[PDB]
Design a protein around this ligand. Structure first.
Ligand code: HEM
Ligand code: HEM
Ligand SMILES: [O]
Ligand SMILES: [O]
Lengths: 153, 153
């Protein structure tokens, strides 16, 4: 994974990308298509482009570069935000508190029971299934961090 | 993963949690500690809590319940946000465009190349290492979505 400073470096350079996203998007697709020409074959609108000059002149290639880097930027920012809250919790629960995954299963059972008890009108079979899935994603994400840290859990 | 309706059900019941986070947190921890007493042994600062009555009377058990459910709520919301960034991209790139992970590796290397070319002063070795790791997490997260959608990328 990334450290806190590494995530901040990713966010910082993406700010520079966004200040000329058209130029960055063009240069990324030109590098991809010149380095790996087979990738051009996926693009009906671009597969005729041979030279860097032709690729630079394509309004459609420039538009697509912006779409790609916008989508990737959103994924990186949301990943960084999730990591910033998940990482410290996995770190403390692995290294200081030493909490096995089975204990996270026990507290997940308690959360599901309490929500069902308190809010049956907002916690029918489907909503309970949804929360069961959400807490399993949470436990699996902690377990993945545990494996990286070498903690058996 | 969860459907959009399933995430809505999770966030709807979490709104009820947030209306009394301390009460929900207390009830979750007392359910956990009464059902699985070995879990209470992990809390050195609750060594004075033996009985259900003592647990209900504890200021700090209730405060800890708030800490736990506040942290969990934040992680669930940030997970949902990142899932929502990945979903449309994994959908189209698995089912319509059929983009192999090797091609995602090629475009990741193109992004690193363009950032090194454009920002050598602000994309040194460490910042490049950070972005290399972030793009690998992106590819791995898409590969996991590919497997869920039944696409061999
Ligand atoms: C960082 C990696 C990538 C990102 C963020 C990305 C993002 C996007 C986005 C947002 C779209 C438009 C909406 C959609 O169809 O999902 C798109 C379309 C597309 N992508 Fe990607 N993509 C990436 C990598 C690739 C690669 C490596 C290829 C092929 C080698 C590829 C091929 C396509 C194709 C063929 C389309 C449809 C183009 C069109 O009909 O206009 N993508 N991509
Ligand atoms: C939904 C699951 C959980 C969440 C969100 C959670 C969250 C937290 C948070 C935010 C803290 C304070 C900051 C920190 O040290 O990381 C904490 C502390 C702690 N957690 Fe957890 N926790 C969870 C499950 C558990 C379980 C199941 C146990 C034990 C069986 C446990 C044992 C502890 C202990 C011993 C501390 C230190 C308490 C203190 O002395 O103040 N956690 N937890
Ligand atoms: O793309
Ligand atoms: O906790």
């Amino acid at each position: 994974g990334l450290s806190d400073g590494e995530w901040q470096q990713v966010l910082n350079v993406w700010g520079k990308v966004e200040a000329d996203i058209a130029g960055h998007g063009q240069e990324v697709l030109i590098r991809l298509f010149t380095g790996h020409p087979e990738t051009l074959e996926k693009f009906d609108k671009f597969k005729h482009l041979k030279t860097e000059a032709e690729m630079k002149a394509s309004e459609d290639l420039k538009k697509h570069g912006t779409v790609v880097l916008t989508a990737l930027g959103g994924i990186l920012k949301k990943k960084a935000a999730h990591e910033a809250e998940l990482k410290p919790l996995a770190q403390s629960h692995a290294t200081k508190h030493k909490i096995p995954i089975k204990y996270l299963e026990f507290i997940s059972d308690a959360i599901i029971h309490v929500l069902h008890s308190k809010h049956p009108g907002d916690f029918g079979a489907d909503a309970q299934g949804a929360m069961t899935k959400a807490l399993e994603l949470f436990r699996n994400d902690i377990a993945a961090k545990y494996k990286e840290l070498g903690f058996q859990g």
